[PDB]
UniProtKB/Swiss-Prot annotation, chain A:
It comes from Homo sapiens. This is Transient receptor potential cation channel subfamily V member 4. Belongs to the transient receptor (TC 1.A.4) family. TrpV subfamily. TRPV4 sub-subfamily. Changing G121V: In FDAB; poorly expressed on the cell surface; mutant channels show a significantly reduced response to agonists. Found in the synoviocytes from patients with (RA) and without (CTR) rheumatoid arthritis (at protein level). Changing F82C: Decreased ATP-binding. It is found in: Cell membrane; Apical cell membrane; Cell junction, Adherens junction; Cell projection, Cilium. ATP binds at K43, K48, N52, Y87, R88, G89, Q90, R99.
Swiss-Prot record, chain B:
It is found in: Cell membrane; Cytoplasm, Cytoskeleton; Cleavage furrow; Cytoplasm, Cell cortex. The lineage of its organism: Eukaryota, Metazoa, Chordata, Craniata, Vertebrata. The modification 5-glutamyl serotonin is found at Q63. Its EC number is 3.6.5.2. This is Transforming protein RhoA. Glycans are attached at Y34, T37. It is a lipid-anchor.
Curated annotation (Swiss-Prot), chain C:
This is Transient receptor potential cation channel subfamily V member 4. ANK repeats lie at residues 1-22, 78-107. The ANK repeat region mediates interaction with Ca(2+)-calmodulin and ATP binding. The ANK repeat region mediates interaction with phosphatidylinositol-4,5-bisphosphate and related phosphatidylinositides. Non-selective calcium permeant cation channel involved in osmotic sensitivity and mechanosensitivity. Activation by exposure to hypotonicity within the physiological range exhibits an outward rectification. Also activated by heat, low pH, citrate and phorbol esters. Increase of intracellular Ca(2+) potentiates currents. Channel activity seems to be regulated by a calmodulin-dependent mechanism with a negative feedback mechanism. Promotes cell-cell junction formation in skin keratinocytes and plays an important role in the formation and/or maintenance of functional intercellular barriers. Changing N5D: Loss of interaction with membranes enriched in phosphatidylinositol-2,4-bisphosphate. The gene is TRPV4. It is found in: Cell membrane; Apical cell membrane; Cell junction, Adherens junction; Cell projection, Cilium. A 1,2-diacyl-sn-glycero-3-phospho-(1D-myo-inositol-4,5-bisphosphate) binds at N5, Q6, P7, H8, K53. N-glycosylated. Homotetramer. Self-associates in an isoform-specific manner. Isoform 1 and isoform 5 can oligomerize, but isoform 2, isoform 4 and isoform 6 cannot oligomerize. Interacts with calmodulin. Interacts with Map7 and Src family Tyr protein kinases LYN, SRC, FYN, HCK, LCK and YES. Interacts with CTNNB1. The TRPV4 and CTNNB1 complex can interact with CDH1. Interacts with PACSIN1, PACSIN2 and PACSIN3 (via SH3 domain). Part of a complex containing MLC1, AQP4, HEPACAM and ATP1B1. Interacts with ITPR3.
C-alpha cells in the first residue's frame, strides 16, 4: 500500500486515511515497515507530508501522528532518519524548521521529536566539499 | 557540561540476545512477551568519569531483508559490540571467518568489544544434556579470554540480560573505549 | 502592426470574423512575425520591453490557437530561427529573455525554457532547457554561431 498511501498523503486528502488503523491492527503492520518506506532513500510518510503542503497546513500530520501513537511506535516513527548518502541523517524536525512553520515544530517537539539529531549528508556539507548548503548540522543551528 | 554524542553499533549472530541486551540497558525491564527484531533510534545518557555521554544505540539483523541494508548502519560508527552466545558454541568460530573481515572492510580503525551472552545458561543441565547429543559443550570463558586477544578486541566481557549482571559495566567499557581518541594515522601518505 | 507596438490592431487582425492573418506565415525572405520582431529589436531600454511583451503575446496566441505546432520551430530561408538570428545579430535584449522564458500558465507551460527544480533554504536550483542551445552536429547551435 506504499504507492496509494504516498499518493494520498501527497494530495493532502484526509478522508482516504480512514480505515488505515483497523488495517494496521488486523495485519499488525508497523508504519516503519520496509515496504512502506521508500527504497530510494528510506523516506517515510511524515517527511513526504511535510515536503509538500498547502500554505503550511497539510492537515494530514495530526492524523498520522495519532495513528502512530495508537500503533505504539511514535518515537521510532517521528525521528526516523534518512538513509543513503545525499540526505543522510535528515529528520522531520529539520524539514519542519526549514519550511518556516512554527506549528509543526511545536507539534513534533511536544510529541517527542529528537532535537539533537545531526544531518550529515553530502548535500549538507560545505560548499567547497560538495554540499550546496551548510548550517552546522543541528536543528537550532539551522 | 555539554553531553558528547557517540555512536555504538551492536553486531552478532541471530538469537544471541543483542536486542535483549540493549533493551535491558534502555528500560531495565526484561520483555518476557514481545521482543522487536531490532531496537533502533535510541539515545541513552551515561556518565563514567566526569563526562556526560549520549550513546546512540544501533542494531543490525539479517533474519529477513536486513542483511541488504546492514551496511548502511556502519559509517560514522564510534564503537562496535561484537556479540555472541555462551550457550551456542557455533556463535564463536564464525566471528573471525566472516564477521571480522566485514567489520574491517566497512569501518576500520574502530574499537571493538567482545561480549558473550547467557552466562547462567553455560552452567544449565538441560542445555548441556541437549548439546551433548552433537558432542558439544558450553563455551569456556577462558576460550573467550583468548579469543578476545586473537581478534585484537579492546575488551571482552560477559552479560546476562535475565539477571542484569554486568550490563552497566559492559556498556560503560564500550563508552570509555569510544571516548578514546585513537592514535593519529599509520603509514600516512606523503 | 506588431513591429509598431499596436497590440489592439494585432489582436483584432488575428481574430476577425471576415479574415484572419495566420501568425505562421513567411515572406519572400522566409522571415515570419517573430523573425521581423527580432530584426527591429534594439538594445534600448524602451524598445526591449515592448519587443519582449509583443513576442510573448504573439507566441502565446499562436500556441493557444494551434497546440500541435510550435511557432519558433519555423525557419527562414537562411535556416536560422528567432533565437539563432538574435544570437547572430547581437541583440542581447531579446536573446536573454528567450533563453530564460518561463510560463506560469498551466495550459501552455510546456513551451517554457526555464523550470524550477527545488529550493533548500537560500539555495535555489533551477533546470534550464538547451534542446537547441547545444547540438552534437545534428543542427546548428547557438553557441557555435
Ligand atoms: N537462558 C537465557 N536465554 C536468553 C537470555 N536473554 C535472551 N534469551 C533469549 O534471547 C533472545 C534474544 O532475542 P533476539 O536477539 O532478537 O533473537 P534472534 O532470533 O537471534 O534475532 P535476529 O538476530 O535473528 S534478528 C530473547 O528472545 C530471549 O528469548 C538470558 O539471559 N538467558
Amino acid at each position: 500500500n506504499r504507492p496509494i498511501l504516498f499518493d494520498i498523503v501527497s494530495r493532502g486528502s484526509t478522508a482516504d486515511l480512514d480505515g488505515l488503523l483497523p488495517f494496521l491492527l488486523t495485519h499488525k503492520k508497523r508504519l516503519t515497515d520496509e515496504e512502506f518506506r521508500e527504497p530510494s532513500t528510506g523516506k517515510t510518510c511524515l517527511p513526504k507530508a511535510l515536503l509538500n503542503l498547502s500554505n503550511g497546513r497539510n492537515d494530514t500530520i495530526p492524523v498520522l501522528l495519532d495513528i502512530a501513537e495508537r500503533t505504539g511506535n511514535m518515537r521510532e516513527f517521528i525521528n526516523s532518519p534518512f538513509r543513503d548518502i545525499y540526505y543522510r541523517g535528515q529528520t522531520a524536525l529539520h524539514i519542519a524548521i526549514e519550511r518556516r512553520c512554527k506549528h509543526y515544530v511545536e507539534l513534533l517537539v511536544a510529541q517527542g521529536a529528537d532535537v539533537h539529531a545531526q544531518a550529515r549528508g553530502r548535500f549538507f556539507q560545505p560548499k567547497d566539499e560538495g554540499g550546496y548548503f551548510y548550517f552546522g548540522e543541528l536543528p537550532l543551528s539551522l | 557540561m555539554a553531553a558528547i554524542r557517540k555512536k555504538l553499533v551492536i553486531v552478532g549472530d541471530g538469537a544471541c540476545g543483542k536486542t535483549c541486551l540493549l533493551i535491558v540497558f534502555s528500560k531495565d525491564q526484561f520483555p518476557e512477551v514481545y521482543v522487536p527484531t531490532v531496537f533502533e533510534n535510541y539515545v541513552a545518557d551515561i556518565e563514567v568519569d566526569g563526562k556526560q555521554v549520549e550513546l546512540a544505540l544501533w542494531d543490525t539483523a539479517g533474519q529477513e531483508d536486513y542483511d541488504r541494508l546492514r551496511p548502511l548502519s556502519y559509517p560514522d560508527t564510534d564503537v562496535i559490540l561484537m556479540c555472541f552466545s555462551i550457550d551456542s558454541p557455533d556463535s564463536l568460530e564464525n566471528i573471525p571467518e566472516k564477521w571480522t573481515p566485514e567489520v574491517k572492510h566497512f569501518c576500520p580503525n574502530v574499537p571493538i568489544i567482545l561480549v558473550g551472552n547467557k552466562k547462567d545458561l553455560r552452567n544449565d543441565e538441560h542445555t548441556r544434556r541437549e548439546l551433548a547429543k552433537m558432542k558439544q559443550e558450553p563455551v569456556k570463558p577462558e576460550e573467550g579470554r583468548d579469543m578476545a586477544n586473537r581478534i585484537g578486541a579492546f575488551g571482552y566481557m560477559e552479560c546476562s540480560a535475565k539477571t542484569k549482571d554486568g550490563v552497566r559495566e559492559v556498556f560503560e567499557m564500550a563508552t570509555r573505549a569510544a571516548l578514546q581518541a585513537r592514535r593519529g594515522k599509520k603509514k600516512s601518505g606523503c | 502592426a506588431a513591429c509598431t507596438n499596436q497590440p489592439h490592431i494585432v489582436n483584432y487582425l488575428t481574430e476577425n470574423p471576415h479574415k484572419k492573418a495566420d501568425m505562421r506565415r513567411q515572406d519572400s525572405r522566409g522571415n515570419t512575425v517573430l523573425h521581423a520582431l527580432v530584426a527591429i529589436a534594439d538594445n534600448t531600454r524602451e524598445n526591449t520591453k515592448f519587443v519582449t511583451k509583443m513576442y510573448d503575446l504573439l507566441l502565446l496566441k499562436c500556441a493557444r490557437l494551434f497546440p500541435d505546432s510550435n511557432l519558433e520551430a519555423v525557419l527562414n530561408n537562411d535556416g536560422l530561427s528567432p533565437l539563432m538570428m538574435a544570437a547572430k545579430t547581437g541583440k542581447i535584449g531579446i536573446f536573454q529573455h528567450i533563453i530564460r522564458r518561463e510560463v506560469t500558465d498551466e495550459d501552455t507551460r510546456h513551451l517554457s525554457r526555464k523550470f524550477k527544480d527545488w529550493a533548500y533554504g537560500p539555495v535555489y536550483s533551477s533546470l534550464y532547457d538547451l534542446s537547441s542551445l547545444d547540438t552534437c552536429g545534428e543542427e546548428a547551435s547557438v553557441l557555435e554561431i
